[PDB]
Symmetry: D2
Subunit: 498 residues, 4 copies
């Protein structure tokens, strides 16, 4: 029997585990330490959650190691491992309303969006990777023959072993799912650290692994702080791989820690300052719709959000007025209400960063066209914001907001290479976009953009089959697609002579 926090909301009775998940069991932290998780819609405490300590990380890694080395997970067929992951996706789908509600409460995710993306995409993720398990293939290789003898060379794809996954708070279930699905499909076991401020879908996911029949110790979940739990994962001598999504500075420190312990493999998705170039020959009304999506989707708490929009001089003014007209129509409110378009920011500290961000933008001389402030109501709501007259030297031209802030610069009519130069003048390279009806421009611009993803006449179009990862200081390695599996596999070369 599992201890729950029960809550009746959204016409459901939520049953939320709140303890550490280690070796198939929900257990209190060492010395029963806990912390509060906060609802961004009204600032209230949802419940108390176990606060993992160093000894708890060690118990989790030990359980993951045992599950990998001696447990059923390491012995079953690749095809049966896949069956378990498909059953897990089915169990998640049976609980999708509940998971989406927990996400609305814990993260401020608009409920209708959370069904489709936060939860719906996580289900797609497990189903996609489940189908990879028995389709992961090595090679046979036509090497030179040590005549008069013969040689056969093959490669074997093998699991890396115990992995640590450290994730951020913007899409708690979905980020967990991206990495976990690929990690488990490859035959590994895992210790997951959700962001401290958003542990609840992760703990509910953990209970779902029990319903799906995932062997004990395969998945272990440790709510708690990065500087304690995350740090110990990256230092642990039995952990062989870290998968990380978060900030550039923490990513640096994680890679350092992987280096100084046991040269564990690492992949890093480190956010960005993604440019969107909008030419005068685009479909303007579509560009407004997609341009706004690029910035405001999931209240701007979106790794690939367009952090700058460059708009061609001759449509710039019409583009801005049309955006303001559409911004006025956005319904801000409780994420659980079906008419809500724009939910609260994830947590209070982040809201404060956003207020300070927009003060600095006004200070340095950009034109505030709308928004810029906390919305007057309970919780942590921020008004959808539009800046124009942004210049390349400005702080808001360089720094990632991670909030609903459209940062617009103009470019001269016909100025393709000049605008690309401005778009590429960043140490980030996560995403980018271009809107234009002209095929020659669309193709040339996507070639020249220095980003891991280029959207053409769309934005936010991710898919579980399409690899997602950054260039330069946005990190390296892919989540999603076949490419993601390579992070979680090792290649063994076997050469016979006969």
């Amino acid at each position: 029997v599992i201890n729950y926090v029960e809550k009746a909301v959204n016409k459901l009775t939520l049953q939320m585990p709140y303890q550490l998940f280690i070796g198939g069991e929900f257990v209190d932290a060492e010395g029963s330490k806990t912390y509060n998780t906060i609802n961004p819609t009204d600032g209230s405490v949802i419940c108390q959650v176990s606060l993992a300590q160093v000894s708890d990380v060690d118990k989790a890694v030990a359980a993951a190691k045992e599950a990998f080395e001696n447990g059923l997970w390491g012995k079953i067929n690749a095809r049966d491992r896949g069956r378990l992951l498909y059953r897990l996706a089915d169990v998640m789908e049976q609980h999708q309303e509940e998971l989406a509600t927990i996400e609305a409460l814990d993260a401020g995710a608009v409920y209708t969006l959370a069904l489709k993306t936060h939860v719906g995409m996580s289900i797609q993720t497990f189903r996609y990777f489940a189908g990879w398990c028995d389709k992961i293939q090595g090679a046979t290789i036509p090497i030179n023959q040590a005549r008069p003898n013969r040689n056969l060379t093959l490669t074997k794809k093998e699991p890396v072993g115990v992995c640590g996954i450290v994730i951020p708070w913007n899409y708690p279930l979905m980020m967990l799912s991206w990495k976990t699905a690929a990690c488990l499909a490859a035959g590994n076991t895992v210790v997951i650290k959700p962001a401290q401020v958003t542990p609840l879908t992760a703990l509910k996911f953990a209970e779902l692994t029990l319903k799906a029949g995932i062997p004990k110790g395969v998945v272990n979940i440790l709510p708690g702080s990065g500087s304690l739990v995350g740090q110990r994962l990256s230092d642990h001598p039995d952990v062989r791989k870290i998968g990380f999504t978060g900030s550039t500075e923490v990513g640096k420190h994680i890679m350092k820690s992987c280096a100084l312990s046991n040269v564990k493999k690492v992949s890093l998705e480190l956010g960005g300052k993604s440019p969107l170039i909008i030419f005068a020959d685009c479909d303007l009304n579509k560009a407004v719709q997609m341009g706004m999506s690029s910035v405001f989707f999931n209240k701007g708490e979106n790794c690939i959000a367009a952090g700058r929009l460059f708009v061609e001089e001759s449509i710039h003014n019409q583009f801005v007025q049309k955006v303001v007209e559409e911004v006025e129509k956005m319904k801000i409110g409780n994420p659980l209400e079906r008419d809500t378009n724009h939910g609260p920011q994830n947590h209070e500290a982040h809201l404060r960063k956003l207020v300070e961000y927009c003060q600095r933008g006004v200070k340095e001389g950009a034109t505030l066209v709308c928004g810029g402030n906390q919305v007057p109501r309970p919780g942590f709501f921020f008004q959808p914001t539009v800046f124009t007259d942004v210049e390349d030297h400005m702080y808001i031209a360089k720094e990632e907001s991670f909030g609903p802030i459209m940062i617009i610069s103009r470019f001269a009519d016909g100025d393709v290479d000049a605008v690309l130069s401005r778009a590429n003048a960043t140490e980030f390279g996560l995403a980018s976009g271009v809107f234009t009806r002209d095929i020659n421009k669309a193709l040339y611009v996507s070639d020249k953009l220095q980003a891991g993803t280029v959207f053409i006449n769309t934005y936010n179009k991710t898919d579980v089959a399409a690899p997602f990862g950054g260039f330069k200081q946005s990190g390296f390695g892919k989540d999603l697609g076949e490419a993601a599996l390579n992070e979680y596999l090792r290649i063994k070369t076997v050469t016979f002579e006969y």
Copy 2:
């Protein structure tokens, strides 16, 4: 007009450049600093070589950056890049005797081995990767369609940009070639740091890039110290990837430096303590030949050398008897003499280390069967050495010698799981081998060995098509094979809506 050190030796005239190679020209280091390179056959000075300084590193990187961003290398067809690399291999072949002789002088490589391996495998490497240039392909992916609209998703494989390559001294030209061929085939430009003690084939290779018509700036070579030149390459904001081969300790430091600068990609090949398991049911004569090769090849200065032999108890004495008989037959001497089959160790400090290594082995209780000492002749020759009665706790059972030292333990007849457990009891995971005529044991043992390469009834059988890299603290990433290209490429996802 290039300055050479000219030397008549081995029935040819060596013309050795000795300066830094930057932006397609040979140039002195800052303040014209130099150092001496030493011939391990007699301890004599071969010549003075430029000693690269930090500002030379910045010059090399800026030439590489400019070659990549604006030069012909970034504009030519992939197929034409391939033609230049195939022409480079042909120029290397035209100079194969000269290169092999430089290698014999600088590194102590036995000339007939150097022609076949050091040089011959380098020519194969460039020809292999030249064929990859126009066969590097991305994907088209069947993503969910944003109905009523359509979506097309593709991936583009793109070069990463300026790369830094830092290599060790055991196979100077061949290590350089493994990494450089894959690096250039992917369309990157490169700054290479050869080990300080062995710069000469690298600088001759650099001259050959001019004869092959490789555009200036594409290849830049900086003889000099790792603590200075290597460090600055790992720290440089314009370098996007480091490929490194060397010690675990330096690899940790490079990975750390990659993190703390700009999260540059890194691959690491870090050596190991590779076990070779010899069962009683093998062909014993062939096991002696291959077992000796596994230790003594290239005077044991060999990343994948077997660092422990486990020999089934019922054949252990007869195996050791036969090994001793063959060691007595080895001809130790000048690497340029055609009768020589064991040349000098690469440099004096390494010779000292081996003497000390064998002292510790005797001290801790291992039976010295033969060798153990410097050979009483000029230069840095070390005796082919056999230890028996080696126990798992011994220092020589855990530490990598990188010298011609066969380290033998017994295992009981019928043991398989017990010896595997002892063979896998290391934080390294580079290579391994198993000799047996039994199919079931061969397959089972290769499955169970925790190493990047498993040889079955052979050893040292590398091939340019077969990926090579370690597990655990032997690092990550591959050299050789199609898999090596992935270290040198980035994946851009492009998603259209139409």
Copy 3:
């Protein structure tokens, strides 16, 4: 509602459709023509089944074509096509006892075997290929650029369209599933011609596609004769691909008919005369068990059955003695009885062929050790048969029996190339096998066998992930594995200049 033949048997109530399945409905053939399907355990009529006519084929193809061009199947995401095929596998699993019972009645398949293989492997097949739908990917290719312009080249993997599947009677549901799963996973629609003698699991499968939600017209099933139905499919101008399994002479005629109509694509699996080579150094008791399986699995009605065993002279007599002991332990009876391990032959005309086959074997001079005859009982049972002293010139050394007839030849001790030569002296090349504990022999023999599949120290080990198809007159193209998808896809190359 659907019309069923109801039958209480095996502690179940069977509900068997018996009509044509066209455009999502069971319908009578033109003129309400029918034929009888025969239970091979007693020779009784199971029921009457619609007898498809030419006008019915034209309707099936029309329904398939509409379903492809205008129906839902042609519009849904690949991922959703995959979900439907997974759902199909789940429905087949929910009905596995019933499907296994129908196969016992219709094909004489021993129920416990049918559950595990005929049905169990069919379920695996649909789940395997369901996983492929959203992982079928084309390429982007680094072509030469028409300077000063640029070029992009990609390939798209597309369905072929309407396919005809013509299958034999030995594994009615399983053969249907192999081809249909790959065909549908690639996005095609299908008209299936089951062998006239075994229509019933196919018709039940048809009903299960309704339960799974497969759009109408995607799967169409036409019980009837090959000379009428099969021939029209192969002639039809709207069918773009035929997948065929059966005899070499019908395969040739199908391929000719594909040629003369509209150059439709064709794949052919044409049976064989598969050699199994048993060396004296194998595990002998295992060789007896695996050797028995290679011949007697599914009453020898097995495309990959070993049609010749070559046994090394020093173990021959002992092998034969041990085989006869095991053959005597075989329980011949009703496939529905749990103790049965050898069921009846599929139908009467095949039983007649087996009797004549053995008559000719005795006539030409082989020694009949046991069997060779119809068992004295109702139905069409054939006694497990062993021949020894078979010479290469004999009819039974050359021609496929497709019955439970073990055909044994000796080869001299130490021969390898001589036995390989005899094993390869056939126009067939479907499967083959080798038993030996010697790694060098196993690898060498597998290299030299001219067959699509080589089993090493096992036999009948097929897997849904492992491609299966023949060389030479055994045909071309693969079922199972990623390779199977290629028979059902076309590649479009798209080249842009910009």
Copy 4:
């Protein structure tokens, strides 16, 4: 010594072999039978060429079988096979002016074009496929394990054996090269039948394989008639694969002959009636330039030639004006004059068909804008022709001219699906094109065109890396690219239990 026809021409002394090439020797046909090859520039006899008989085909196939089974070609490393094919490409390059002059003489290929395309692409083809030899790789597959035992499954890619290649007369050397390079890269041996009317570059090519060191019997060339030589190749019991390019009717007959002999593999490229769709929003002057190339390239003797141009109503009349202006500037004459744009048709019978084709187009009501008859001058020149007011039911809208005849229909402005319907209403499916600056039209149109190749904003842009082959009655299988290799390889599955 080799017998040559010597000819002083184009500043060279051509040395042209004229005999059969069998087993590395040039030999007369049976009974010293010969035929005349005709210069299409003036109708003169170039020389007499051996006329292969049935007994000559059997000798060529015997030489190829022995070369494959017992000769060096079947024994060398894949990498060494690649080196020989690279060297062959280099020998062809050394003789490129000579080969291009022979092509001018024998096929009427314009010399400047023959250098760049007929010969230049043939050289690229060998170099591309030479790079594939050591990169052809099979798989290791994660099958279910027969517990308590283990299983390993791998695939091996192997050559098919003796192949026959039957080619047409439009690009004699280039079609030979496409097929032969992929065939040989995969490790096969080959018997080539050049079109009877154009044997000379093939026989010169054969001599070049001797200079390149291709082992004797690997390549065999038999000039002679399709109905005798080509027929015997497709009937031969030792030929395992036919690669064919030519007409649909011959291709059907070839495929039928493959069926009835020994089920040999077959690939077919059968020409087309390829539509080029030109929208009003294209770059019009470039549309005219590319539209002209699409038709008139290589005097229309081009299997991917646009056989219908659909031009949007609002630009139709201007398009046709510009075309007539460009056609009047075309220089018609001797293929050796360096200003010739338009050479003679390949041979007399083809010229006569072109005259009848144009009579038929006029008779059925199409408007002849220019040309339509034989240029008055010696040889077989045909006037570059333009037809407008072409309607869908017309013979010239359905049938391939294979000549310099632009066949233009309008389509209504703003229609897209309707023009697609008309473009797709053919049983052919080889190539197609679309000219438009609109990205959404380009992508949608390329998706909907039922053709193996779609060109966007270009035409005739083939590349040795980009697979080329038809859909529907244009045949199946690819030439060029990695995909071509699969026609020439077979897959062996090897499954171990241990």
